[PDB]
């Protein structure tokens, strides 16, 4: 399968969540995402194939995964936006105020800014500390999705945001929106990942 942002993946033929960015590891293909998604050793698949499974993750206290996928799999330093595609360029870190975009298999590619960093969500699991808070919207399904800047800066994945009973916060204004992601760089120096980038 061909390894995009944004993507669809399921574990354990189960759960869905997206594909955040395609990473190596030395010689090892991956690919980072929230690490609600699944437990280490879970298979992930892609379109009914299996492409990898869980290598390490922690969740609650962060919510951080990688994938470590078959050497069959392609890894592309894309994000999915619609029919295109969002280049990843590399992953400075965008301020608060920074216009942002995210992908994912819900409610595909959205976009706003960044208005606040080290936000805390209290799941049913225990607490996420840490977190950057954007109002871009978000549903059920989109976890673990890319979080880029429209110039093509890597920010983190999606982690959680406060929902409404149509399984997102689409409906409600931006202004009311808690759209919650991980930061990538500790998860790429945790692991000791490199970013694929165009």
Same mark, same amino acid.
């Given at each position: 399968?061909?390894?995009?942002?944004?993507? $669809?993946? +399921?574990?354990?033929?189960?759960s869905?969540?997206?594909?955040?960015?395609?990473?190596?590891?030395?010689?090892?293909?991956?690919?980072?995402?929230? %690490?609600?998604?699944?437990?280490?050793?879970?298979?992930?698949?892609?379109? %009914?194939?299996?492409v990898?499974?869980?290598?390490?993750?922690?969740?609650?206290?962060?919510?951080?995964?990688?994938?470590?996928?078959?050497?069959? *799999?392609?890894?592309?330093?894309?994000?999915?936006?619609?029919?295109?595609?969002?280049?990843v360029?590399? +992953?400075?870190?965008?301020?608060v105020?920074?216009a942002? !975009?995210?992908?994912?298999?819900?409610?595909?590619?959205? !976009?706003?800014?960044?208005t606040?960093?080290?936000?805390?969500?209290?799941?049913? $699991?225990?607490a996420?500390? %840490?977190?950057? *808070? %954007?109002?871009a919207?978000?549903?059920?399904?989109?976890?673990?999705?890319?979080w880029?800047?429209?110039?093509?800066?890597?920010?983190?994945?999606? +982690?959680?945001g406060n929902?409404?009973?149509?399984?997102?916060?689409?409906?409600?204004?931006?202004?009311?929106?808690?759209?919650?992601? $991980?930061?990538?760089?500790?998860?790429?120096?945790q692991?000791?990942?490199?970013?694929?980038?165009?």
């Open positions: 399968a061909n390894i995009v942002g944004g993507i $669809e993946y +399921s574990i354990n033929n189960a869905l969540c997206s594909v955040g960015f395609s990473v190596t590891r030395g010689a090892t293909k991956g690919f980072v995402t929230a %690490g609600h998604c699944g437990t280490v050793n879970a298979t992930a698949r892609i379109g %009914g194939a299996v990898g499974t869980f290598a390490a993750r922690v969740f609650p206290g962060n919510d951080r995964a990688w994938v470590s996928l078959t050497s069959a *799999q392609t890894l592309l330093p894309r994000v999915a936006n619609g029919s295109s595609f969002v280049t360029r590399g +992953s400075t870190e965008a301020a105020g920074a942002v !975009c995210r992908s994912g298999r819900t409610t595909g590619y959205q !976009c706003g800014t960044i606040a960093k080290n936000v805390t969500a209290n799941y049913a $699991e225990g996420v500390r %840490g977190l950057t *808070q %954007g109002n919207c978000a549903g059920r399904g989109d976890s673990g999705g890319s880029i800047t429209s110039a093509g800066q890597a920010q983190g994945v999606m +982690s959680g929902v409404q009973s149509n399984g997102n916060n689409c409906g409600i204004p931006a202004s009311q929106r808690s759209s919650l992601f $991980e930061r990538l760089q500790p998860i790429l120096s692991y000791g990942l490199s970013l694929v980038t165009g």
